[PDB]
Amino acid sequence: ENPIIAINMAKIANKPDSYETMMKVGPKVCITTASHPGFLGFEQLLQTGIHPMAGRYGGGAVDMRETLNPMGMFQYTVWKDVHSHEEMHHDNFKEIFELCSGCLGMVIEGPWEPYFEVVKSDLPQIMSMTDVPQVLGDSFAKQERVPKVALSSQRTVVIGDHWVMDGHEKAFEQGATETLEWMKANVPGMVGWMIMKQFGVSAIGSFQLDPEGAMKAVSTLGANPPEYNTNYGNKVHDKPPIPGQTPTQYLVHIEWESPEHAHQGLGHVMVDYELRQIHNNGVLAHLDKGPYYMFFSPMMEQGLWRKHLK
Amino acid sequence: ENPIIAINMAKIANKPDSYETMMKVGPKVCITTASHPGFLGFEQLLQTGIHPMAGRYGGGAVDMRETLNPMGMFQYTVWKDVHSHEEMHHDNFKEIFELCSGCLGMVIEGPWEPYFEVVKSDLPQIMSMTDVPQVLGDSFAKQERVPKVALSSQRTVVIGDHWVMDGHEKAFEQGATETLEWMKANVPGMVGWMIMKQFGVSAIGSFQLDPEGAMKAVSTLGANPPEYNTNYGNKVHDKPPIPGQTPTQYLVHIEWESPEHAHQGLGHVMVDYELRQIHNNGVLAHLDKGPYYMFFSPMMEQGLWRKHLK
Amino acid sequence: ENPIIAINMAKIANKPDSYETMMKVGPKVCITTASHPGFLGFEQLLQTGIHPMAGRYGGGAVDMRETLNPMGMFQYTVWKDVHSHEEMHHDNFKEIFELCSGCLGMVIEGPWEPYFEVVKSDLPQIMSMTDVPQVLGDSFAKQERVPKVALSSQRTVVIGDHWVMDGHEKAFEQGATETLEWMKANVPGMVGWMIMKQFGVSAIGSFQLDPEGAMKAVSTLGANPPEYNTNYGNKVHDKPPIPGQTPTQYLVHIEWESPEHAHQGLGHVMVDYELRQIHNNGVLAHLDKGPYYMFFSPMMEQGLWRKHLK
Amino acid sequence: ENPIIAINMAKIANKPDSYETMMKVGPKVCITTASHPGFLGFEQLLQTGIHPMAGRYGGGAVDMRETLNPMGMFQYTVWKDVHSHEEMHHDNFKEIFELCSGCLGMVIEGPWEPYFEVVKSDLPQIMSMTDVPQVLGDSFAKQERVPKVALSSQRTVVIGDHWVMDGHEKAFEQGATETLEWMKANVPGMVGWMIMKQFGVSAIGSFQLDPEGAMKAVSTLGANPPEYNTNYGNKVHDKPPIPGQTPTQYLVHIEWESPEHAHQGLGHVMVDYELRQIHNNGVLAHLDKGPYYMFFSPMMEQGLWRKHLK
Ligand SMILES: [Fe+3]
Ligand SMILES: [Fe+3]
Ligand SMILES: [Fe+3]
Ligand SMILES: [Fe+3]
What we know:
The structure is cut from a larger assembly and holds four copies of chain A.
Chain A: E1 4-12, H1 16-33, E2 39-50, E3 71-79, H2 82-91, H3 93-103, E4 107-112, E5 114-122, E6 126-127, H4 132-141, E7 150-151, E8 156-164, H5 169-186, E9 190-201, H6 211-217, E10 242-243, E11 248-256, H7 259-266, H8 268-271, H9 273-282, E12 287-302
Parallel strand pairs in A: 6-7
Antiparallel strand pairs in A: 1-3, 1-4, 1-5, 2-3, 2-12, 5-9, 8-11, 8-12, 9-10, 9-11
The complex binds fe (iii) ion (FE) (4 copies).
One fe (iii) ion is lined by residues 6, 8, 77, 85, 89, 113, 205 of chain B.
């Protein structure tokens, strides 16, 4: 099972009111989403900082939790296919509109919800500390490898934004794969990774309605939604209505034990000679833009989608 | 061996004095209880909060330790049979009356002590961190499965209150079992579970005496107990004197690594599509009341009773 | 005319926001309720404490207004019959859902809404001080007995929770009657009384929906209600869908001039020999649980239902 | 290897100055002791509290670190035989005298240094967290049982003082053995145990000199020691010069993960029916005095003596 991942990207005000509405409205959006049989899971990621990359982004820091405003908020929803996500949005349009109408009071930019293909991954199941002895015992019984420990809602997620030169997509994919496999084998605290390729955008999920829907959307506080409609019509799409951007965007999702392991870990592409060659030739040579690494904390996860990858 | 569980339910004042008397008198009652050969163990549970269930109980919170008053206090005592518990209460009536007379100064509601049958369970033995390597080694030697780690007095116990529709008891038992097994296989930090069915109540354990005994009970500070007697007479009963309530009450006992794991873990019946179908059709469809989940911390435990379940 | 009383029982957070939402939304619910021709009146009761009963509940107090959290909130709605209440809930389901969706942010437990039969009563009409001279004169004119003065929203309501042993219902009713008639003749400040017998529960009124309705109820902030439906179907019932609990619950409703009169007055079942014999043999001898007395202040009242009792 | 343990028992002032002289002088004494080939290791134990034993010692507490003054200080030195300890004391008499002369400024009672036989033990080797995976792997390789984890200078040591009735010594040893073996199999956080029998006292180690030596001992600040001599003369003894006390003293040394595990764990001899019979009949039935349990922290350990026990 190679699912599709829709990533709802927003930048929200960094103030206590925003954390309150995320804890009150967030669960309700996930509950509505999980009414659909194609829904496989989610990751709610709150930005905590960036990788300064040895001064390339010297105004930032690994830990900007006190200073970042707006802060990024990424919601992965994981689906059997694009149609399931678009259909869920259509079937629950009124209710999601009512909910997101609450969220818009903290929104500074977005939402923008691209669809991503999981090109390749090595992501363990999430678990807790008290699960580890049984996971260990089960692995020996099944003669399977014990995974890296991905602590549920207790680890660091890093996302590297890459724009890849036209025609370099495959070279980038193999080079990123080789980089990440080396890191998982050799760098302390590397929990797992996933290479994501944007191939389209959800119009409904990005609040990109037809002109009349856009008017009605601000003519209400949430109780009187617009009609389901976009600049691509009002039917439920099998393929993303909005084309993927070019140059092709790849999101490199890397999980680490902690922010320090992530900061020191990503730095190996500069301070280990062999990894530097792999990354320079396999990734950097193929970029129009990036890499740029944002640090996130997983606030809530429903991680069963990880159980059926590869 | 499936033992019987008497659950003494009380609501006590949340103030320093209450913690004082729980540590001074609490042990003394258990010492009295452990004189009887039918006594198998106990659990002292102090309420710490509730599951707000996506705003269904929005005035509450996972962590209400500072604001809850009264706070729930559940005392499990585990027995070979009902007769053992009634006999212990009869044989030690004067001393338990003396001890509990001190405890009534912190009581706002209760006590009420129903009897519960353990319908099904998957509960590991309790241990501590420094036991875990040896438990791992012993499991492998014995070719047995390593359990989830249930840390003695260092984890979260959640109790979900369900009233089941007349005639739906067996369907509920099968649905709850299937829900809990899925959760233990798939949700991080789920330590164990137990399904409990109320089938009667102890009159003596609930402080429900005959009228003259009730008068004498408050005509003393503890040194001059009433005669052992109830509205069901003064004999030691083989079966609970007070019938189980209808609609049938089931308590779903779930242990978790922490309050956060319990909160997010219980949420999976709403945000995982597959678990949602199991729980909706196997549990929610059979309820007159609930579910309502109270969070507890195990203050003191004598957990050998867990060793002979199933 | 002996009406039916639905008592919506909830426990709410004791904090300033809860009094605020009670003042903005509370009236709106009553206005919705009064659209139905079967609606006879209401009592909004806010818990102020308990009766400690000479140390039987020594952790509580007559006045717990500052410390009780959650605090009980009981709403009586009085009806010609069960069908009228169920029909009101059905016809106004969308609006009651919108209104109560707001209240859930202060709810810690509940709502649970049982139906009660008025077994017997001696309750005066409510009035104010400036009404008393005319009530006195009118009583003399009509040669009627002058009532106890029940000051509108200015007196104490106490509710005694009793669980009666199977088969003892009639003995309890007569014994409670004799106790309450003695107290009204002999105890200072006793304003009136009513014996209520639980015979069923409203599913819709207890927010106990079918499973999909339960999911949808938390998939909205109030503007997108679930369909009217329960585990007992979607028809408007003539009889309570949910059976009354067993052992039979009786609530003894007693009105008093003030909390001090209630505390001292209820104590007469222990400190007056003659009343003690009546209450011991006529009430206490027939109980599985209780008695437990909660103290309430009537916040808002529409008391015309009292005009047609007896 | 059945070594003998000399336990230097003192009570020292609980004030900052005492910890300093323990850090400046403490190591120097151990270095002197380790000059002798019969020296096997040491345990430096500082009292942190007591077990109140359900109110039998209600003035005490598990944690008395701020209030105990004086506080117990027990120094185990472990020897191939009595002669080795006496010879070390003789060969280093001047230097030990100089060092201990400094220690006497914090001494309120003691030192008293009895000799103990290790009657039976189940004591693991000490290790640290970062050793645990390798100890686990080594245990599987050698087909051996994984031990309880005894963290070096990071766990709780409890000592139970028992005076045994004349003629009951062997029965006490068996009953204590049965108690401890049950606890280690069944009680969370029990790291290990050792049963120690006092069979003599060192005169030199207890600072019990001949009368002229006692005079000179206080006629100096440490630089002019008395001649090596006692009320048993000035030879190096093969056997303890001072007889063991009667009634025979036994010290039950039990190691626990933490004070909470020790407190709850020891309580099982009262709150578990089966262990209660074992301890009542096997231990309590044979005592003139006790049990009295003091809580200690191991401040410094040289634990290789544990490696050759059993
Ligand atoms: Fe979406
Ligand atoms: Fe009991
Ligand atoms: Fe209602
Ligand atoms: Fe010595």
